[PDB]
Design a protein around this ligand. Sequence first.
Ligand SMILES: Nc1ncnc2c1ncn2[C@@H]1O[C@H](COP(=O)(O)OP(=O)(O)NP(=O)(O)O)[C@@H](O)[C@H]1O
Ligand SMILES: [Mg+2]
Ligand SMILES: [Mg+2]
Length: 307
Amino acid sequence: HHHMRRIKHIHFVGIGGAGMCGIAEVLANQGYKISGSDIKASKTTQQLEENGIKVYIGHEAENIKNANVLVVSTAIDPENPEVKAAIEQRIPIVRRAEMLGELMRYRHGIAVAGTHGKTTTTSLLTTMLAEENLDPTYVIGGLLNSTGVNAALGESRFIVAEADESDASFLYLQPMAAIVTNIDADGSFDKLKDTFVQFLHNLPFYGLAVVCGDDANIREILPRVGRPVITYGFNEDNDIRAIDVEQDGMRSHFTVLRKGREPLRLTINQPGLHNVLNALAAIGVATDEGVSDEAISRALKGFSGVG
Ligand SMILES: Nc1ncnc2c1ncn2[C@@H]1O[C@H](COP(=O)(O)OP(=O)(O)NP(=O)(O)O)[C@@H](O)[C@H]1O
Ligand SMILES: [Mg+2]
Ligand SMILES: [Mg+2]
């Protein structure tokens, strides 16, 4: 991937906050100098230090020394001393989602959205690409148990990332493929559906959206999407269907049907009908990306979960 013009030192304000340390880890593995700051030392900050990322405790204006850009979680608060010093010194400040957007530039990015099941689905799809030997970069909002990290840099073109709908963060992403697991109510619910539509409009006109056709709210916004859509679910009118579902204690067995493919029997190593649906979402993108049946089966059968 190309260098970012004149960016050598990136400083994360609130690096112990959610979503921040995974981006910092990927950028660090790419060769950027990564520093950060946070209110209180934590298991996240103690660890970031262990991989060479200096993590100041307490926000002092001097913590942004030598930084070329600052990363904040969502909004820019001028009352924060590091933020205020950066504005005084004309240092750029971007939100986390915009920095994640830049990791997708020049990559084949897959953004996993939905109200529930993003972390699980992102993990499943990442494992499927790993099993196909496609070494993906990934950014998960949780510990991938198979690797022991939230996020890692891969050498392939792929990056799989959680796409957060809160604060409309995911509109800063420019993916080549997207998942929407569900759109659940519990601003207004109508604005929220609009933003999911906007998110999919960020796909290129030829990009793929894999969405759960069992969800009535997803079904409602499909006429507005204007991109290639593949629906998954249990219902009969889905492009991708799990049938013959058997809940077997901590494991589930099902058959996935896919247009132009022979029926495929699978076992997912996690309980719950929602995780069969999450696996269908990952299967959808993985199939389109060329992942073999064997890689999909191995990934699902032995799935170590997300911490
Ligand atoms: N498809 C689903 N539909 C509804 N609930 C689900 C689904 N998948 C998982 N869950 C539930 O959501 C909980 C958290 O799952 P997770 O995969 O971390 O979701 P997320 O979309 O990443 N959530 P958040 O990042 O907190 O907005 C799970 O432990 C389940 O209780
Ligand atoms: Mg949430
Ligand atoms: Mg999550």
